[PDB]
Nucleic acid binder design. Structure first.
Ligand SMILES: [Zn+2]
Ligand SMILES: [Zn+2]
Ligand SMILES: [Zn+2]
Length: 88
DNA sequence: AGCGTGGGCGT
DNA sequence: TACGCCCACGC
């Protein structure tokens, strides 16, 4: 695995396989937040994170617990992972 | 718990 | 370039 896209910001040595991945990373250095919620006007570094953020406004929870008799559901897959882990 | 926000990665 | 995921830490 070769990673030709290197970060040159001070004290950073991160490198990446893709240019969009590098550019995404560099936003953590610059504080740039190109993506704005049209509901609450909060701004975000990443479009995918804006997308899941917007679910906060609708209560959309596409990830349902599969445990018998459990009615819990979640906005994000990782919430469901943590929840299923908890059921054990 | 709910979700911000890095990491990774596919298409 | 765009769109979209899963992983998983931390508050
Ligand atoms: Zn960097
Ligand atoms: Zn919002
Ligand atoms: Zn459950």
């Amino acid at each position: 695995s070769e990673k030709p896209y290197q970060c040159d910001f001070k004290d950073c040595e991160r490198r990446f396989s893709r240019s969009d991945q590098l550019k995404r990373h560099q936003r953590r250095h610059t504080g740039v937040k190109p993506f704005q919620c049209k509901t609450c006007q909060r701004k975000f570094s990443r479009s995918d994170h804006l997308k899941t953020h917007t679910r906060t406004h609708t209560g959309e929870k596409p990830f349902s617990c599969r445990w018998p008799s459990c009615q819990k559901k979640f906005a994000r897959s990782d919430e469901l992972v943590r929840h299923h882990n908890m059921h054990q």
